Design a protein around this ligand. Structure first.
Ligand code: HEM
Ligand code: HEM
Ligand code: HEM
Ligand code: HEM
Length: 107
């Protein structure tokens, strides 16, 4: 099977890069993130050409990179969407896990 990479990976397609740590996410199935495409979990980088390669942050299509990391109501939970559910009503966790600045994603 594909193996989880080391912690400390940088997502740096944008001027607001974010560090992603697989170990913290080990209770999430791999294929919730590396989701099926044409019936097979796809482990390519998310912004591979033909994937989430649209770097317009207002785009809401299946190519919109920002959309795939931030929005609710998506077919697979996004970073922010899952974090909102995790934080629940806890305001401190909302800031830490979902804040647009001063959060664990963005300084
Ligand atoms: C589950 C144990 C699991 C596996 C296996 C896995 C693999 C994996 C690989 C091989 C990479 C590197 C891709 C590359 O070629 O650079 C990678 C990268 C990311 N992953 Fe992952 N991953 C597993 C689990 C999870 C889970 C549960 C999530 C979502 C909460 C997730 C997310 C990511 C992200 C984001 C990246 C970086 C990709 C990018 O920036 O394009 N992974 N993973
Ligand atoms: C990389 C780990 C990665 C992430 C993160 C990601 C997220 C993502 C979301 C949140 C959706 C749902 C969007 C919605 O509006 O419903 C989604 C959907 C699709 N993706 Fe994706 N995706 C990641 C990786 C990849 C890769 C590597 C590809 C291209 C091979 C890709 C493609 C697509 C496609 C197509 C969709 C729509 C799927 C469907 O409707 O069944 N994603 N992704
Ligand atoms: C989407 C690519 C994504 C990112 C980015 C991300 C980041 C992230 C950070 C920065 C933390 C805090 C710990 C750390 O520094 O690593 C964190 C914590 C949790 N996450 Fe996450 N996360 C992304 C995606 C997802 C998805 C899609 C889910 C749920 C399906 C998820 C869940 C969690 C959980 C649970 C934690 C731990 C929360 C806590 O309070 O410690 N993340 N993630
Ligand atoms: C709060 C809802 C919030 C905002 C607003 C926000 C903005 C933001 C911007 C402007 C970018 C850059 C987009 C571009 O193309 O210029 C960006 C990028 C990423 N973000 Fe974000 N972001 C908000 C919150 C969060 C949170 C809480 C997380 C982590 C759960 C997160 C994650 C990401 C990821 C991943 C990226 C892409 C990093 C990269 O590849 O450079 N955002 N965000």
């Amino acid at each position: 099977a594909p193996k989880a990479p080391a912690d400390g990976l940088k997502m740096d397609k944008t001027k607001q890069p974010v560090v992603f740590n697989h170990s913290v996410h080990k209770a999430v199935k791999c294929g919730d993130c590396h989701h099926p495409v044409n019936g097979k979990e796809d482990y390519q980088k998310c912004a591979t050409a033909g994937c989430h390669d649209n770097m317009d942050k207002k785009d809401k299509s299946a190519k919109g990179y920002y959309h795939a990391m931030h929005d609710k109501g998506t077919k697979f939970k996004s970073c922010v969407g899952c974090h909102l559910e995790t934080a629940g009503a806890d305001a401190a966790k909302k800031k830490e896990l979902t804040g647009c600045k001063g959060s664990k994603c963005h300084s």
